[PDB]
Design a protein around this nucleic acid. Structure first.
Ligand code: NA
Length: 262
DNA sequence: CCCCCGGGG
DNA sequence: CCCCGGGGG
C-alpha cells in the first residue's frame, strides 16, 4: 500500500515520472527509495513511536519485524537515529556490505549500533555479491586443494553444467564443514559472527517489490538467515552444494567471476 | 573496465 | 540452475 510515507518517497524519487521502459533507472531509484524508507521510519524516537502504531499498519509491520529480528522491545528504547553508510573504504573482500545503520539508545545510556544491508527485488532470491574464488577461500578458510579447485571450476565454467554427477556430490561433501562460514562470509564479509560492527551488516532487509509497488518485507538477523539457508541447502536437492545460496556468474567483468544469489 | 544492483526462462 | 543487462565510478 502506498501509505502516506511511501507516497511521499515515491514522489520525492520521481518514480511515476519514469517511463516504464527505463528499467535500469527504476531499479536504482527504487533501491535508494527503500533504503530511505527504513531511515525515515527510524529517523528519531518521535518517528518510531509514531510508526509502530495501528495508525500505520504497514510501517508498524516493518518496524516490528526489525525490532523482532533484534529481540528488542519498543518500550526499552529511549532514543533512535539512523543514517546512510558511506565509509569510502574497502576491507578484505571489498567494500563493506553495510548500506545504513540504526543506533538505539537504552535507559542506562548504553546503546546498540545496527548495521544494515537493504535490497529490493521482485523475487525471493536476488544477487548478494560477486567474488573471485581466491577471495572466497581466503575469507572462509579454504586452502589449496580439491575443494578450492572444484569451486574454481564452477567459476571458470560459469555454472556447474560441466561437473559430473560425482563431482557435484563431491563439492557438496567437501564444503559441508564450511557451510555456515561460507554463507556468513558471503553476506557479511566475515566468516565468524559479528555484532554492532559497522563493517559487517547485522540484519538483512529484503523488500519484495513487484511492478514498482511494495508487497512485503522480510528482515532477518544473520544467525537466522544462515539457519534458513542451511535448512534449504540440506534438502534432497542440496541447493548451492548445501549452502542454500544460488551459485552463478558475474557478467560485469572480463575475468571469470562468481556471483551468489540469496 | 570493474563492481553493485537487478532479472528471464 | 543457467544465461545475462543497466549504470555509476
Ligand atoms: Na546506502
Amino acid at each position: 500500500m502506498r501509505t502516506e510515507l511511501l507516497s511521499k518517497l515515491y514522489d520525492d524519487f520521481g518514480i511515476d515520472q519514469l517511463p516504464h521502459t527505463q528499467h535500469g533507472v527504476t531499479s536504482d531509484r527504487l533501491g535508494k527509495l527503500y533504503e530511505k524508507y527504513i531511515l525515515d521510519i527510524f529517523k528519531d524516537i518521535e518517528s518510531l513511536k509514531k510508526y509502530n502504531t495501528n495508525a500505520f499498519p504497514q510501517e508498524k509491520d516493518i518496524s516490528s519485524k526489525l525490532l523482532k529480528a533484534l529481540n528488542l522491545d519498543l518500550d526499552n528504547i529511549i532514543d533512535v537515529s539512523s543514517s546512510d553508510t558511506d565509509l569510502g573504504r574497502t576491507i578484505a573482500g571489498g567494500s563493506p556490505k553495510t548500506d545504513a545503520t540504526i543506533r538505539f539508545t537504552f535507559h542506562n545510556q548504553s546503546s546498540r549500533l545496527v548495521p544494515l544491508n537493504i535490497k529490493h527485488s521482485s523475487k525471493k532470491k536476488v544477487s548478494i555479491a560477486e567474488y573471485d574464488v581466491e577471495t572466497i577461500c581466503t575469507g572462509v578458510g579454504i586452502s589449496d586443494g580439491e575443494l578450492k579447485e572444484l569451486i574454481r571450476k564452477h567459476q571458470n565454467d560459469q555454472s556447474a553444467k560441466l561437473f559430473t554427477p560425482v563431482q557435484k556430490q563431491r563439492l557438496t561433501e567437501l564444503l559441508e564443514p564450511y557451510r555456515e562460514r561460507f554463507i556468513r562470509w558471503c553476506v557479511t564479509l566475515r566468516a565468524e559472527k559479528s555484532e554492532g560492527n559497522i563493517l559487517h551488516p547485522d540484519l538483512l532487509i529484503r523488500f519484495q517489490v513487484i511492478d514498482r509497488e511494495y508487497v512485503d518485507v522480510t528482515i532477518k538477523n544473520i544467525d537466522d538467515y544462515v539457519s534458513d539457508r542451511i535448512a534449504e541447502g540440506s534438502k534432497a536437492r542440496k541447493p548451492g552444494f548445501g549452502t542454500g545460496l544460488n551459485w552463478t556468474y558475474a557478467s560485469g567483468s572480463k575475468a571469470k567471476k562468481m556471483q551468489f544469489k540469496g
